[PDB]
Amino acid sequence: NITDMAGRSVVIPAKVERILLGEGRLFYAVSLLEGQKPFDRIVGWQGDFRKLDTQTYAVYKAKFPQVDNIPLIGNTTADSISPEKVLTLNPDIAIFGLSGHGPGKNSELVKQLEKAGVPVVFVDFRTSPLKNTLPSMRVLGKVLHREQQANDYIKFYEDNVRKVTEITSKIPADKKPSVFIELRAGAMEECCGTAGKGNMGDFIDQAGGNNMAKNLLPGALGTVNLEKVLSTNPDIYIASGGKAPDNNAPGVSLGAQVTKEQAQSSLQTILDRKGINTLSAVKNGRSYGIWHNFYNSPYNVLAIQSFAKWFYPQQFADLDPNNTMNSLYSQFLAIEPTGTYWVDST
Amino acid sequence: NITDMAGRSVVIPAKVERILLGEGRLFYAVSLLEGQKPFDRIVGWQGDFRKLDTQTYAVYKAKFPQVDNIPLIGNTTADSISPEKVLTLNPDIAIFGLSGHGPGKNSELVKQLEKAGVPVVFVDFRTSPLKNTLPSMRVLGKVLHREQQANDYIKFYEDNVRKVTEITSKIPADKKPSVFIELRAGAMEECCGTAGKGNMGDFIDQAGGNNMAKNLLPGALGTVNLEKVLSTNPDIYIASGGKAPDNNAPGVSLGAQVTKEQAQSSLQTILDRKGINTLSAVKNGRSYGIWHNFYNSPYNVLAIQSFAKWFYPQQFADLDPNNTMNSLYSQFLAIEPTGTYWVDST
Amino acid sequence: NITDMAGRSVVIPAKVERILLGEGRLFYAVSLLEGQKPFDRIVGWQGDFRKLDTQTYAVYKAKFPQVDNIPLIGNTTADSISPEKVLTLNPDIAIFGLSGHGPGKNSELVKQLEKAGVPVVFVDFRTSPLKNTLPSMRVLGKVLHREQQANDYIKFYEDNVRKVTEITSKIPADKKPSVFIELRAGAMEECCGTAGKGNMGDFIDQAGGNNMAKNLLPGALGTVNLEKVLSTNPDIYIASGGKAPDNNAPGVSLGAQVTKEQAQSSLQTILDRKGINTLSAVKNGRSYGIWHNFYNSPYNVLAIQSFAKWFYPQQFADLDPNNTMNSLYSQFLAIEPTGTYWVDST
C-alpha cells in the first residue's frame, strides 16, 4: 500500500499493463519509467498531450506510429471526458493530477473508478512542484513496478537541483532579483497569467528569485493586470509558451521542433507588446522564454536551472541545462533531444 | 485495585484487548505503551484524534491503513457519542478524561458502562497537567499491563522536565517574564482563548513564566478580551495552533506535516492581526507558536521545554526540544518524527 | 548491485533499518550519512566504539542516552563476537572491515549471515585508506540510501585533501622528510608498533613525507624495534594515542574530552622514554601527537592535513585542520566538536 498526493491510500496492483492517464502530459512522468517501451502500458489518455504538446507528440510518432492508436478519453478539459469510454478500456490503474486539464480528487469519474475496483493514484507537478515532484515519482515507481527507474530519476533530479539550491538557499532576500513570470504570454484572452505560491513560482523560489506575484495571489495559478506588472517593474521578466513554429496564433514558440531563431523571433514579438516593452527588465535585456509544459512535468529541473542562470548569470556560468537535458534523455528516454526549451532575448 | 484521576477505585482487567478511548487524543498516552503495535488493542475511539489531529492521523495511516477501520463512537463533543454504538463494541476497559471533548466522571455513559461490568479509568493531561500527567501514565501502565513502558516514560519525562525545573524553581517571581498564551489563536469566533490555573498555564508555571491569565480566570480554560491583553502588555506572547498546511481557515499551522516556513508564515499572519500587532512582545520579537494538542498530551514535556527556552533563551541555550522529541519517538513510538511542533517569529 | 571493498557483489536492499556494525568505530562512516538521527538505524555493534572510544561515546550519550541500549555483539576482538546474538538482531545489512577488531571476509559469521540471506558490505579505512576511503563512502551511500550525504562528503574530502596534494605532489623525493609513526606509543607491551605501506603510512605518503617503515614491513601494520628507529634517526617523530584524560595508564591523551595542556603533558611523557628521547626529531622539537582512531576513520583527512603542516610548516601555515574538522561537524554531524585531536611538543 502507498499514500498518493491526495493523502489517499492506494493498493498497488500486482501487475500493471493498462494505465489510464487522467492528464495526457502525465506521460512525462511515465516516460521516465518505461525506458525504450514508452507506450506499451498506456490504455488511454486525456487529449492534452496530443493536442497541447503537438511537437513532443510528433517526435514520438515518427519513432512509434502506434501512439496515434492510443484512445483519447477527452479533449483538454476534465468536463469533456466520457466516463463510459474510460471504463470500457478496463484500466488496471488510473493516474490523475491534483490539478490541471483532467479530473481531480472529488470528480465523479474518480468515484466511478472506485466502484469499478480500479486503483486511482494522484500525483502533482503543477500545484506544489517543490513538495510533490519527487514524492510523485516515488509513488509512480511503486504502483507501476519501476522502483529502479524512479529511484534513478530522483537521484538525478536531486543532484541537478542541489547544484542550484546549495547556492541559492543561503542567499538573503535583499540580494534576490524580483521576477515576474507570464504564463502562456501573449496567448491568453486577458493578460497576464502567472504563478503564485506554487507552479513555476516554486521554481523562482528554488532558483533564489523573488516572485512578484507570490503575495498577489491565493493559489498556484491566477492573473495579475498589466498595469500592476508595470508598476512593480521587476528586475527580470520571463514568458512561458509552447507554441508550434507554424502556428499563427499568438505566443512564444518553444519545444522539440523549434529552432533558436524561431524562439528568439517569437519571444521578441511577445516583448514588443504595448506596456511590456517599457519594462526595465525588457529594456535591460533581462527577458527570457521558458517552455510552458514545465509547469506540469518532473523534467522541471531544467527550468529551475534556466531560472538560476538568469537570476545569477556568473554564479551559474558553469551550469548547462542542455547537458542536464541530454543526460536526462540518454539515461531515461527513447527519443533524441531536439529543439529549444528556453531562449534569451537578442 | 488502583485509584484513577477522578479519585475512583478501578479493578485492573486480567487481560485487556478492547480499549475504548473516550477522547481520541488520549491515544497519545496509549501510544507510549503499545510500542510497534499502536492500534492493536483499540476497539473504538472519539473522532477528535481523526478529525482534530488530521496530520498525526495521516502519518499513522500511511504506516497502518487499518486505523481507518477503528470505529468512531462520535465526532468532537461528548454529546455526539452514541452510548449504544459504544456498548456494542464490548470494551473491556474505557479510558476517559476529567475534561475535554469526551465524557466526564458524571456522564450517563460512565454509569451505563458500570452497569455493563466495564472498568472505567479517568486520566488527565488537560485540567491539571502538573498534578496529573505522571500519575495518569502510572495508572495507564497498571490497567493496560504496560508497567515497564510507563515507568520508562516517567523516567524520561521527569529527567527532561528536571532539566528545566532545576533552573526555574529557584527563580524569584519578580525576575519572571509575563506571558500570555492564546489558544487556537486566530481560529476562535471570539478572541482570546487562553489557560488559567491549569492546562498550558501549568507549563508556563514550570518553565518559570508568569501567566497573565492565572488570576483572570477561575478554571483551566477561559477567555480574556483583546483589550485586557493589550493593557497588560505582557513580556512574551505565545499562540497555539494545529492547522493543516493546506487549510485556508484562520489559525497557526503546526504539526507532523508542517514545514518551518509554513509555521513561520502562518504565525506571522496571526501576529499581523489588529491589536496583537502593537503588543510589545510582538514588536520585540518575543512571539512564538506552540502546537495546540500539547494542551492534552503526556508529550507536553516538549512544550514545557520550548516555553523555558523562550522565557530564558541563554539559560536554556544548550537545551534542544527537537532531540527530546526524537528521543521520545525512537524510544517509544512506531512512526518517524516529522513537521514543526514549535516556531519562532522571523 | 554494488562491489564492496573485498571485491564481492552486494545486493542493495530496498530499505535499510537494521544496520549491524562489525566494528563499532565503523560508526564514523555511518555518522556522515545519518545527519541528526545518527543511531536510528543501528541494531547492534562491536563494543570497540564504546570501550576504545570512550570520549566520543560519552559526547554522543549526553545528547542521545539511547546509545547505551544499542546491543554489543562482542568486546574488542572478532573472536569474542557471539554469532547467535548477532543473528537474533535480524539485521538487514552488516557492515564489516577488511581488517580490524571485527570479522574479516573469511570469518564464519560472514558465512552464517550469507546463509541467513543478510547482505554483507566490506569497507576499508584501515588497510588501504588511500585506495579505499572514498570508494567505501560511495558504497555505503548506495546501500544505506544516503547517496546525497555520501557525495557531499566525498566532495568535501577531495577538496580538503587537494589543499595538501596541490603542494606535496610536486615535491621531489629527496626533499621529503623521513617520518616514523609510533601507533599507540608507550601503550604496547613491545615497542614499536607502526604502519607500513598502508594505514597511517598512506597519510604520510599523501602529506609528502617519507615513511621509514614503508619497506621494513610487508603489511599495513607491523612492528619495528626501537634500535632500528634510533639508527634510521628520522626527521620527524609522530606518536598516536586516544587515551582518556583521567586514565593514568601509559599513552598519549587525545580525543573529544582532552585539553591541549593534557595532550602536551602526556605527549612529553611519551617523548621522555629511554631511546626515544635521543632521537634528533625529539631534540629538534619535530615531535607530534595524532589521535589513534584516525587509523580507521573517513575523518582521516584531518590527519593528512595535520601531517602536511608538520612536514612543511610554512608551506601549510595558512591551512587549519581545526577549521576543517568544524566544517566537517557542522555540515554532517549531530554533535559539537570538542577536545584535542592533534598536539605539538612544547
Ligand SMILES: N=C(N)NCCC[C@H](NC(=O)c1cccc(O)c1O)C(=O)N[C@@H](CO)C(=O)O
Ligand atoms: N480550457 C479551459 N477552460 N480550462 C483548462 C483546464 C485547467 C485550468 N487551467 C488554468 O487555469 C491554466 C492557467 C495558466 C496556464 C495553464 O496552462 C493553465 O492550464 C485550471 O487550472 N483549473 C484549476 C481550477 O479549476 C484546477 O484544475 O484546479
Ligand SMILES: N=C(N)NCCC[C@H](NC(=O)c1cccc(O)c1O)C(=O)N[C@@H](CO)C(=O)O
Ligand atoms: N482557466 C481558463 N478558462 N483558461 C486558461 C487555461 C485554458 C486554455 N489553455 C490553453 O490553451 C493551453 C495551451 C497549452 C498548454 C496549456 O497548459 C494550456 O492551458 C487557455 O489559455 N485559454 C485562454 C484563451 O485561449 C484563456 O482562457 O485565457
Ligand SMILES: N=C(N)NCCC[C@H](NC(=O)c1cccc(O)c1O)C(=O)N[C@@H](CO)C(=O)O
Ligand atoms: N464544540 C463544543 N461545543 N465543545 C468542544 C469540546 C469541549 C470544550 N472544549 C473547550 O472549551 C476548549 C477551549 C479551548 C481550547 C480547546 O482546545 C478546547 O477544547 C470544554 O472543554 N468544556 C469544558 C467545560 O465543561 C469541559 O469539558 O470541562
Ligand SMILES: N=C(N)NCCC[C@H](NC(=O)c1cccc(O)c1O)C(=O)N[C@@H](CO)C(=O)O
Ligand atoms: N467550548 C466551546 N464552545 N468552544 C471551544 C472548543 C470548540 C471548538 N474547537 C475546535 O474546533 C478544536 C480544533 C482542534 C483542536 C481542538 O482541541 C479543538 O477544540 C472551537 O474552537 N469552536 C470555535 C469556532 O470554531 C469557537 O469556540 O469560537
Ligand SMILES: N=C(N)NCCC[C@H](NC(=O)c1cccc(O)c1O)C(=O)N[C@@H](CO)C(=O)O
Ligand atoms: N585486541 C586484540 N587482542 N586484537 C585486536 C585485533 C586487531 C589487530 N589490531 C592490531 O594489531 C593493532 C595494531 C596497532 C594499533 C592498533 O589500534 C591495532 O588495533 C589486527 O589488526 N590483527 C590483524 C591480523 O589478524 C588484522 O586484523 O588484519
Ligand SMILES: N=C(N)NCCC[C@H](NC(=O)c1cccc(O)c1O)C(=O)N[C@@H](CO)C(=O)O
Ligand atoms: N594484535 C595484538 N595482539 N595487539 C595489538 C592490538 C590489541 C590491543 N589494542 C588496544 O588496546 C587498542 C586500544 C585503542 C584502540 C585500538 O585500535 C586498540 O587496538 C593492544 O594494543 N594490546 C597491547 C598490550 O598493551 C599489545 O599487544 O602490545
Ligand SMILES: [Fe+3]
Ligand atoms: Fe494548462
Ligand SMILES: [Fe+3]
Ligand atoms: Fe479542544
